[PDB]
């Protein structure tokens, strides 16, 4: 038996929005420490990884570990039934063939109970390699999605280059090219805006703009994206949650598109 | 000679919007005490019925009874030409071959005189029965249409069930289920937020969501919808005007779509 | 070498927006006194002509006169970048094969630099002899596009008739017809809402509503359009900038559309 209550239903909606469009059929495995999910797009270059701590809920309790296979686009149909600020409680049984979503309003005399039919999804789970990154940076999610959205008009590839307190996004395509250069700074007056490069080695990696355009959809979960780049492993884009996170692992282009399985092996 | 005058043109526009998406070709009957209209969907499940009392006009004069056959989508093209706040004056002659719409502003000697060609529409007036309904309820137009819009994600059929001070909407479909339970409560704080119910008899009917979604388009005429349900009659959805109304009669599904002609016969 | 700076990038976006939908491949000629552009639609009915004086730039310099052939729809992709209020600097070389667009934000130390590949466009330039117009008028750009957008609901032709302190737009079509008449006046409380007419002879011209709908897109540049109509010359619609303008020369219909090339000959 599972009983997870979100203080505001919009949170679980913003989370699910964060990686539908990249993958549609996801296994949500509910443990007693929270809910985790992992999924790889059909091109095998982008790996979504979800972690929600018990702490992120108003109340959470999972008797046994349970796997909830869900179609994200049908789940998001249900998740638009909220009143944005409603009490969303995910509830399920022992060997559930369906989960229940119970939207509660504070005004009471008003409760809505939706049932999502579950699905059997084969689970290819890939151990995420504990690895050190050459250059880890952090910037407001707001400005990153604007950098990505601008340059993707110009090319199918965006390149990230970290050199000595220089972060350089470049896109070169048929109609032309673009550069946006940002340098690390703290503005304590309003500190939710610092660019924090930390560079061991310089890194020059190129990614498909299409995957980055799906990654920036996680911006609705955190004020700042943390990006961690390594010369020869997938890049980590991370949006931080109340006490979990949404992580996109992006196989870079070396430029041949490499696949995420060339770094991460099955369980 | 007909000279109807809406001090605010927006009101004849919100009226037509309430059922342009339901029936296209409608006959507007203009007599001495006001205007009536009646139309049935091409599937003969929905019966729209319009009534505008004279009191709803700022000025109104109709010498002898006149019928205006109109293509609602062409009328709505013209009705989108105002400033919302213009005084729209509806005008016609004897044996009218076209109607006149006269938008007047109060912020300038501005007059946009439009002419809509009239149309010959076969009259299919059906009598109305409205026998003592087992149960009648009323709720905010806002709250009703969101209930309908939510559940229609889940199934093609919405079922309404009235019991002791409990109104239950339920939708059962391929991806899952949804039910909303509301309880009558009258609330002096603000009168617009009161759910009213009178159950002489408990009653449950199932309707096509596709039709309900056209019915909720009437939300733009009153802040509250009135619903009247009986076991062997069509359901009555009613949006009230200042001395008028727009009503939808909906043939229920009792697993089969029944057609309104099994309840209403010709004139 | 060319260095043209807009104080706000917003201006060059709304300028290009004003006629990207009318012609796609435009030659922008930078002389030292500013930038000029002229282009004709594929139907040879509408002639766009642009003029930006240096007075319109925050900063401006052009050593030798240079022509930049540009694809407007590719240019507007770049012009969608930046923060609308950045300092956009247009930059070019001797025989430039590319333009450089430099978005600066006057708040942080961030510079975004785009390069647009140029285009080889044959300079179909027309000598323009505007002559005397029988009638010239001016009204709010707001009100003109609302008149045009309204009346094109009804027909493919809109007729403008100037006669005795009366401006009369008429549209006659299949579903019906509409006429709006405006009279010349002045309200000093708000002096940008005034209709100004000056008539030597009355004029009655008919235009294609498709062309008018592209012309009204210039409203994003000025609060007022100036219209000048003569009997057998194209109509002039003009939106004024601080030091320059965007003007449309529109070959009238006489039931038959004339071609701009029947009034203006090659250079």
Please give a structural write-up.
Chains A, B, C: It comes from Saccharomyces cerevisiae (strain ATCC 204508 / S288c) (Baker's yeast). Chains A, B, C: This is Proliferating cell nuclear antigen. The structure is a homotrimer of 267-residue chains. Chain A has helices at 9-17, 72-79, 141-151, 209-215, and strands at residues 2-6, 25-30, 34-40, 46-53, 59-62, 66-71, 87-92, 98-104, 110-117, 135-140, 157-162, 167-172, 176-182, 198-199, 203-208, 224-230, 233-240, 245-250. By secondary structure, chain A is mainly beta. Chain A has two domains: 2-117, DNA Polymerase III, Chain A, domain 2 (Roll), CATH 3.10.150; 135-255, DNA Polymerase III, Chain A, domain 2 (Roll), CATH 3.10.150. Chain A has a nine-stranded antiparallel sheet with strand order 6-2-3-4-18-17-16-10-14. In chain A, helix 1 runs antiparallel to helix 2 (72-79). Chain A is globular, with a radius of gyration of 20 Å. The A-B interface holds A 71, 74, 77-78, 80-81, 98, 109-117 and B 150, 153-154, 174-183, 185, 195. Strand 13 (176-182) of chain A pairs antiparallel with strand 9 (111-117) of chain C.
Which labels suit this protein?
homotrimer; 267 residues; mainly beta; DNA Polymerase III, Chain A, domain 2; 2 domains; 9-stranded antiparallel β-sheet; 5-stranded antiparallel β-sheet; 4 helices; 18 strands; 13% helix; DNA binding (chains A, B, C); DNA damage (chains A, B, C); Pr_cel_nuc_antig (chains A, B, C); DNA-binding (chains A, B, C); DNA polymerase processivity factor activity (chains A, B, C)
């Amino acid at each position: 038996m599972l009983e997870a209550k979100f203080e505001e239903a919009s949170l679980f909606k913003r989370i699910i929005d964060g990686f539908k469009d990249c993958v549609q059929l996801v296994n949500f495995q509910c443990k007693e420490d929270g809910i985790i999910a992992q999924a790889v797009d059909d091109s095998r270059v982008l790996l979504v990884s979800l972690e929600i701590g018990v702490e992120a809920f108003q109340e959470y309790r999972c008797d046994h570990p349970v796997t909830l296979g869900m179609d994200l686009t049908s789940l998001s149909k249900i998740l638009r039934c909220g009143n944005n600020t409603d009490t969303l409680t995910l509830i399920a049984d022992n060997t559930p063939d369906s989960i229940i979503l119970l939207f509660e309003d504070t005004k009471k005399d008003r409760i809505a109970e939706y049932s999502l039919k579950l699905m059997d999804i084969d689970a290819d789970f890939l151990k995420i390699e504990e690895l050190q990154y050459d250059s880890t940076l952090s910037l407001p999610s707001s400005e990153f999605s604007k950098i990505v959205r601008d340059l993707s008009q110009l090319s199918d590839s965006i390149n990230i280059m970290i050199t000595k307190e220089t972060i350089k996004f470049v896109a070169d395509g048929d109609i032309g090219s673009g550069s946006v250069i940002i340098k690390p700074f703290v503005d304590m007056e309003h500190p939710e805006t610092s660019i924090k490069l930390e560079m061991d080695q310089p890194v020059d990696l190129t990614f498909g703009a299409k995957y980055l355009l799906d990654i920036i959809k996680g911006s609705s979960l955190s004020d700042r994206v943390g990006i961690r780049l390594s010369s020869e492993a997938p890049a980590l884009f991370q949006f931080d949650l109340k006490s979990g996170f949404l992580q996109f692992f992006l196989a870079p282009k070396f430029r041949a598109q490499s696949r995420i399985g060339n770094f991460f092996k099955k369980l």
